[PDB]
Design a protein around this ligand. Structure first.
Ligand SMILES: O=C(O)[C@H]1O[C@H]1C(=O)O
Ligand SMILES: O=C(O)[C@H]1O[C@H]1C(=O)O
Ligand SMILES: O=C(O)[C@H]1O[C@H]1C(=O)O
Ligand SMILES: O=C(O)[C@H]1O[C@H]1C(=O)O
Ligand SMILES: [Mg+2]
Ligand SMILES: [Mg+2]
Ligand SMILES: [Mg+2]
Ligand SMILES: [Mg+2]
Ligand SMILES: [Mg+2]
Ligand SMILES: [Mg+2]
Ligand SMILES: [Mg+2]
Ligand SMILES: [Mg+2]
Lengths: 427, 427, 427, 427
């Protein structure tokens, strides 16, 4: 038929695994032939997932650290990149609360449809692509890379290893650069800072990490895979079958059949070492923002895996000034980066920016009507000297770009949008 | 074999039209038998559409005026109601830019899939329902009506009279309280403050308004129908067939076959009078925020229809302080209300609050990391004095409500969320 | 501030539970006050869910039995009702294979997004409503109830008790009449006639049935709830915690931590009795179509619960003539109905009709081009004698109904559809 | 900072347009530089759209003709390819009737959301990819190309040139091989065999075709572009502005402002000649299946454009045997192929096979219960001689494929599906 999309040979894939530094200290318990057997006759190219994963991997080794904020709409991600950030964090918590395919508001318990995060990945890429298109026709070189890598939340995989596989494949189709996977029971999943967490056995999470690598290999992209452990706070586990988990099992049960288990940094360090051959970064959820506890985790893991990169949640679930003074707050990310936490992110930044800014505006509007909105518009005009552009909302969503399409199709069109607009006249 | 959902008889429907004050001075050019003929054997009840439309109609007569801000996410609408607003505005522009079913960023040109605004209507109602559920279990009586009426953008109907009908039907199924319809050609639709607008004949828009009323009648709900005219700025019209449009026709035609027409307040007043028997409120798009021009329009329409209520777009496409001083800005909505503009709204409030707040946070985060986020969290804490609740984000999205479901199913559950959470421990 | 959608009092709900025969021998382990506490301030009416559940309950008592075929498209359901069937079966297997929101073809292992079956419930109700609308304007009274009740697949709930709750709520919002729930581990769900099945403890499935009943009570509809057991073939269970399951536990363990258990009719009878207070119908999956085995199950359950209705899967996963002669096949459903199997259904009837009919057509088309299609068209003409109407495909999908809408809006319209069509001129 | 997805230079694009025989006699009224200006900094690869369009173009030149049947589900397309067909036809009519994103049943009047056909394109490609994956692990070599090219319905563009552009881009993203575009007014669109059709001016449709080619060029794929004319039956046109349309105008205008126009083969030939530089295939809708009318059209177009390929709708809206005898039906497609109709398709084959097969099964089921289903199952067993495989429904939807994923992840899994299935035991 065609050679478009012809799959590589097993020999070619193996040679890449053997020689490319990307795969240094990456364990695959399946074979190159196993991957080829799953690829059918044609392999779709995933341009944005390949580019994003390559850019992310290089940034993790070139920059002092890579930091990000949670984004739940496309416009949110556009502003993060315009303001200088070099990666986007896609929070599952935020999707549950305000951006999932059921249309409902949910707490962070894997309640929403499992294709919700992939749809938001695709949306963010679409929004960044439009900003890129607009910058090109405008001659705007201020942003070097509009297509910042997206790191997205895989939660606990919404089921078994096959649900993990399908979620990873959908995230890649949408253009994700990295995805993270946590060792909780999917049916009882929680935000790391909620109670009632139930762990699964160490080997079951290795199965999840293997399945996420397998889906990326079958899709022929070098996706960044992140392992997260919830063992710092969880006091339940589903089974005592894994000998690595038994040192923490107390022998108590629950009515549901769960096993009580002893939480803290020790099972976290043990699990992280077990996950390390199967993860590009490792992340330990913590109960407080504590540089000393982060140091103990980092040093214990790197005692055995010196080159293992780590990730850290700078969570809005912490009351920051109840825990830390302003000087420690200001140095927090820089100190973490020196310990090897190379990916750092504020999970719920978008939820809090969106909810606070609308409450603040709506409250003033309820009291004083247009005066409250004008105060916001003036702050927007003032932000232009910092690089803000969305004051001109028509060009910001592509009115000029679609004007260019329109005049390319018909240079004599009587119905283009920007000429004669109030944006042209008053902005 | 049931009486659930049995339709009314034509006589009952006619009797309501003849006697209910809601229908005073409402023209229906079809009959009550026509409505019944289209209803099949079962009529679904649309509870939120019925309640919303009833509340909106009463508020339009009981309050000095009803105002609103554009909302493009569910959380946005929740904060608007929490802050004291009594209606939600659903902007088609914002849906094009950041919340439509294609996943793309679009300018305001009817480019997105035609069921996008109904999906956002349903989302907003779901989010308000969750806020109401949470308030009930928390004993929070501070908000009297969580289910604020939604007024939504029907654009130019996405085609002909049948496309209008299906869009109105879908908005009602989603729970809309009112919808607005503009006299533009759908294939060339623009934001009212963009150039290149093409009007359709006066009688064609009467057909659109009739189709919107018919869909509401067949759905058995008293939806508020709003007519918008774009004739202040539009210099093209599709045809000269309507004698009411011929005074403004110059005879010149474009190469597309459009007719050039004389724009301004005069065609607006003529079209408003023609639309008045077919609309609960009438809205003129304007190029500037000008109280004197609004009075000229109001007095001209009320000279023939003294009881006709009007709507006004307090548009972010205006540069407010370039046109008006601070005292005029402060009184702007109050003065419009005295002229009969009983529904007033800031279309793109959500776009600007969302884009500005994320730019500001991300810019600070790029420079100072955690310091910038703590400034926001501290402002959130301070806003609790004003009624803000989203600092406790877990309860805000229903963690406590779903805990109550879990303990209702199984009072001995070991996996509830709020007990043990950092929110309980630190907030 | 309106009375539309006001919730009932707990006293009203309790009086209905205590005295309505619908709730005879129905156990609820939560209270009427618990239901009111979860309902917020407004309860949406679910007309089609209410009517469908009421019609299904009456049919299960008035007809000798209720039978159905699996439907995966709206047109499929329309033809089932046109042909005289009185219920529709919505198979999750078929949704996985050809009608789910991921767009992918899946085997029956709970891989698709959890809102997929609700979306198909809504589609089927929409399609039946259109057939009803067309019949009314055509004066066609040949079908007494176009809105046949839909029984839909809730699989294993896609997680924990809260995932069950949300799926049931969404099925109800879409208009379902009944739903079924199986005692399998969601993360390892299988078609009942696949291998590798894992049971959950008896009490965990009671929790699922309680959650399904609770969602229906909060939504204020009398949804028919069906409990399915997979214990005839399953040899694994997640835990031995439940004393009712311990008699069948063999003591042997897998590497994942599962427990081997003795399968067969004995644990099915035990689980059926435990589920009976929580289910309107009970369904045991079987490995062969066997009237003797069905009699043994029915008599053992009715020995304790004489009035308990049962459901039976006449599965296409059986090779029917390999097991039964033509006389037994002919009387199979009638004999089951006399044992108390009041709901009987062919799960995969839609998959097999669709796949076989297109293979047959396309094979003949590949050889003989138009001759193959004309043979189908002539069979369709011949079927009009049994009441088939889809030969006239324009009116079948509502061309005449939308013509009636168009001429209600504008009786003098020049652009109606059926006048001048080839359907009007050639059929 | 990556080279992944780097766009081509304008010089490279121009050299391909100038020298590649794919673009012989293809007029582009915009420039190579215009295309580059719209591509941003990264161009996504569209593997399936590129491969499909390349295979379609070579098949149109290599085969005596390419024929297809309308498919509205993924399984339908799989059976068409299994049966030996080399292309899939994606009917907008069928999507309107039973497979669109509103969930409603619609007549063929551009009522459904504009992204509905792209979603079905993606679905069909997903289903063909699964059949390909299954075939590979089964060693099944009986089908040479599972990824048959998809030709999809663009209707009248759902608006203006920009709506056309976005629909073409979405079809390509989904993997389409070719798309067709008709010269009707979008707001009044009809099936070609319904009444009430309104034409747009000849130059307006050239704009549509130019926009469709532009979107394919910006997406860097050689999509096959098909132009359809509805002038055989339409008696209305929006405007007389175009001098090529003026010979058929009568001068009369309707109350809506439409011009009356003389329909027939003569305006179809005129429009085909004007469309030919902008279309890879040309299609004239006809009122009857008439081989001499097709020869008149083909000879008139090819006299001026000798190499112009044509397409023909073998429509189920024709009553075939009241127009033609069996001998003519049998040679119909072969005779058309000799005239240059190289793509021929039965638009509504899927609707009719689906509706008839379920009516036939359900009618028999209502009378005879399981005997009627067993008749179908036995017809499926008999069709295995011809290559039918879906009787084994578990492997048909990928139970064996996902078993292979599962044992690749964990070779000792206790929970694989096919082992212990009734399919393995009774089939
Ligand atoms: O920061 C948080 O608390 C939320 O992001 C969720 C998590 O940590 O799991
Ligand atoms: O305020 C605006 O300019 C945008 O809302 C859109 C409109 O006016 O049509
Ligand atoms: O009948 C079948 O085999 C399929 O419907 C699925 C099940 O039984 O679970
Ligand atoms: O074949 C048909 O009649 C329908 O496919 C629609 C069209 O022709 O436009
Ligand atoms: Mg998360
Ligand atoms: Mg590692
Ligand atoms: Mg708008
Ligand atoms: Mg009025
Ligand atoms: Mg099932
Ligand atoms: Mg019972
Ligand atoms: Mg079509
Ligand atoms: Mg050509």
């Amino acid at each position: 038929m065609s050679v478009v999309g012809t799959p590589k040979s097993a020999e070619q894939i193996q040679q890449e695994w053997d020689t490319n530094p990307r795969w240094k200290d990456v364990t695959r318990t399946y074979s190159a032939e196993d991957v080829v057997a799953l690829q059918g006759s044609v392999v779709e190219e995933h341009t944005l997932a390949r580019r994003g994963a390559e850019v992310l991997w290089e940034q993790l080794h070139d920059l002092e650290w890579v930091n990000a904020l949670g984004a739940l709409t496309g416009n949110m991600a556009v502003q993060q990149v315009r303001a200088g950030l070099k990666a986007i964090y896609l929070s599952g918590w935020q999707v549950a609360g305000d951006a999932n395919l059921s249309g409902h508001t949910y707490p962070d318990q894997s309640l929403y449809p499992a294709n919700s995060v992939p749809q938001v990945v695709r949306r963010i890429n679409n929004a960044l692509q439009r900003a890129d298109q607009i910058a090109k026709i405008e001659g705007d070189t201020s942003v070097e890379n509009w297509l910042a890598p997206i790191v997205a939340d895989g939660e606990a995989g919404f089921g078994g290893a096959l649900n993990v596989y399908e979620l990873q494949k959908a995230l890649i189709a949408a253009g994700v650069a990295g995805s993270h996977w946590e060792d909780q029971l999917a049916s009882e999943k929680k935000c790391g800072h909620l109670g009632g967490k139930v762990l699964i056995p160490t080997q079951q999470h290795i199965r999840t990490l293997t399945s996420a690598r397998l889906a990326a290999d079958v899709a022929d992209v070098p996706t960044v895979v992140i392992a997260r452990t919830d063992a710092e706070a969880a006091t339940l586990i589903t089974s005592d079958v894994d000998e690595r988990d038994q040192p923490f099992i107390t022998g108590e049960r629950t009515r549901e059949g769960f096993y009580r288990t002893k939480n803290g940094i020790e099972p976290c360090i043990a699990r992280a070492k077990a996950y390390a051959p199967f993860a590009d970064l490792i992340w330990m959820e913590t109960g407080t923002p504590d540089l000393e506890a982060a140091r103990q985790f980092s040093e214990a893991v790197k005692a055995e895996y010196p080159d293992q990169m780590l990730a850290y949640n700078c969570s809005p679930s912490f009351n920051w000034k109840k825990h830390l003074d302003d000087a420690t707050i200001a140095k927090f990310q820089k100190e973490l980066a020196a310990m090897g936490f190379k990916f750092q992110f504020i999970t719920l930044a978008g939820f809090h920016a969106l909810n606070y800014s609308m409450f603040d505006l709506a409250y003033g509007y309820a009291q004083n009507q247009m005066s409250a909105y004008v105060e916001l518009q003036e702050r927007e005009f003032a932000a232009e000297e910092r690089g803000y552009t969305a004051t001109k909302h028509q060009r910001e969503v592509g009115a000029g770009y679609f004007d260019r399409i329109a005049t390319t199709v018909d240079p004599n069109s009587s119905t283009t949008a920007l000429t004669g607009s109030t944006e042209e006249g008053q902005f």
